[PDB]
Structure 1
Amino acid sequence: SLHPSIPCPRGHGAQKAALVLLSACLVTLWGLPEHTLRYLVLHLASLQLGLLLNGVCSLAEELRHIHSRYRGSYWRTVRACLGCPLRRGALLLLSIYFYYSPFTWMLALLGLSQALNILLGLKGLAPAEISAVCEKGNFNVAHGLAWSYYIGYLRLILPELQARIRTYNQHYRGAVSQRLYILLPLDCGVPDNLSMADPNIRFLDKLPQQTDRVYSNSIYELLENGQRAGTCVLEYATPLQTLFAMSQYSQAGFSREDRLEQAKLFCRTLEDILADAPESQNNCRLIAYQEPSSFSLSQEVLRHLRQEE
């Protein structure tokens, strides 16, 4: 409705043309009794056991990710596989009602059939269905936030940064490390400053220019037992402020479980980009955390600081 090449969203034409081929194929059965209907649900059973066997093998992948992806909860993992046990398991019981009115040997034939369907890669997802699951969930916001952060901000501020650090040391007493530490709070909730987030980190300063775009940089000196054992540059992650603010934007249904699944994905993608980047080979260093026994993040920065040298 904006440009003729702009694709409109998907409609219900998949369901619409489904009943047409249903009504076409149903009247062919009128071309020939009642003997078919016991065979119909038995074949309809075999589609469900194939889907049920496709769930349990994918469950073997999921137990690798019980702690991270599913917070140690065994019930969510079974709920994550198999789609919907209600609409699947109901027709499975209805089949055995019709099945009575060498079964394991008959059951074993469909067993290995679905195995090679997975092994040969025959369970293919079409690029129509691959696309239609991607534009369905409007909050797929994780790779765009990672890729635009590297392109728009990190590609620009990192190669200049080493010169802005050394001129502060030529200006002086306090030796600041030559890396950029980006904090990634998973409980996203980003405040404006950092003195209130931890009173162990209570500096403020402005990193000077080179001597266009003006990226103000503040150096926060850790005050381990009231003493600045470490001085460093700390910035938050501006994409995490967006992920927070979409959840507060209640006109879009973005919940705190949907936010936490992307913020973990945002750190994995941003760790990938800084692996093979020309500029961040030794400059960037992400410090992710999620504090509930809420410990001090000033310690874990100092662990990342003393591991530098």
Structure 2
Amino acid sequence: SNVADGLAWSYYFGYLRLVLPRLELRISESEYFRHKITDRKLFILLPKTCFTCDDIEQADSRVKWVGNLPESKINRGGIKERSYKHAVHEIVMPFPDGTEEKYHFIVEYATPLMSLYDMSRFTDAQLTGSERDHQVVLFIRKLTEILGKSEECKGRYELIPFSGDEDKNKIADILVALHNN
């Protein structure tokens, strides 16, 4: 088929199908985060221009990494237990009267996109610049279709497509907009 089809299905079968159903239970186990995270869903970032996947907290004074959730073991694999954990980001929306509104979100990048970037940049590449950009669009569209039909992931994810370079400061405003309604 396509290069993106494998990456989107690998992203789902090897990760999203495993951690999204466990997401509400991980937050309940964390006595420090159980009351801080109101939106118990994984906000997946889908960068379209840049693929370095830089830390979002470095591009916004309102975004601050405040630690990780307790790790959990996923039995999916071959005679090897893998461990996953989620990082929690604190979003503090300021107001002109000095008051604040504090939020907490589970935000992660779509790591398979970083693999699409690694294929094209090195010499003797599998894909050129134009051939990779098409796979990036197909990846975003395919990952949406997979999660839209997955019944065990319904209501436990959000897809945020954006140009992952100069507008990382837009993440904080998008997360709060999805939280309010």
- Normalised-by-shorter TM-score class: 0.7 to 0.9
Structure 2 segments unaligned to the other structure (5+ residues)? 74-80
In the TM superposition, residue 175 of structure 1 has moved relative to its aligned partner by 3.9
Matched to 1:221, the amino acid is: E
Number of the residue aligned with 1:156: 18
In the TM superposition, residue 189 of structure 1 has moved relative to its aligned partner by 1.8
- Alignment: residue pair count: 169
Taking only aligned residues, the RMSD between alpha carbons, in angstroms, comes to 2.6
Distance in 1 of aligned mates of 2:165 and 2:115: 21
Number of the residue aligned with 1:242: 115
Number of the residue aligned with 2:82: 213
In the TM superposition, residue 193 of structure 1 has moved relative to its aligned partner by 2.8
- Structure-2 change in CA distance of 1:298 and 1:150 (3 Å): same
Identity of aligned residues (%): 33
Number of the residue aligned with 2:43: 181
Where is the strand percentage greater, Structure 1 or Structure 2?
Answer: 2
Distance in 2 of aligned mates of 1:197 and 1:261: 27
Is contact 2:50–2:165 with CA below 8 Å preserved after alignment?
A: no
Distance in 2 of aligned mates of 1:207 and 1:286: 21
Number of the residue aligned with 1:299: 173
- Residues 237-269 of structure 1: CA deviation (Å, up to 9, x unaligned): 111110111122221153332222111111111
Where is the helix percentage greater, Structure 1 or Structure 2?
Answer: 1
- Structure-2 change in CA distance of 1:247 and 1:228 (3 Å): farther
- Structure-2 change in CA distance of 1:199 and 1:257 (3 Å): farther
Distance in 2 of aligned mates of 1:213 and 1:287: 27
Number of the residue aligned with 1:268: 141
> What does 1:222-237 correspond to in 2, within 5 Å?
222-225=91-94, 227=100, 229-237=102-110
- Structure-2 change in CA distance of 1:267 and 1:172 (3 Å): closer
Q: Which has the higher contact order (CA 8 A, sep 6+)?
A: 2
Is contact 2:46–2:109 with CA below 8 Å preserved after alignment?
A: yes
Matched to 2:102, the amino acid is: A
Distance in 2 of aligned mates of 1:142 and 1:172: 35
Matched to 1:305, the amino acid is: H
- Residues 21-79 of structure 1: CA deviation (Å, up to 9, x unaligned): xxxxxxxxxxxxxxxxxxxxxxxxxxxxxxxxxxxxxxxxxxxxxxxxxxxxxxxxxxx
Is contact 1:185–1:289 with CA below 8 Å preserved after alignment?
A: yes
Is contact 1:246–1:254 with CA below 8 Å preserved after alignment?
A: yes
In the TM superposition, residue 291 of structure 1 has moved relative to its aligned partner by 5.8
Distance in 2 of aligned mates of 1:288 and 1:224: 22
In the TM superposition, residue 223 of structure 1 has moved relative to its aligned partner by 2.4
- Whether 2:77 is the aligned partner of 1:204: answer no
Normalised to the residue count of structure 2, the TM-score between the two structures is 0.80
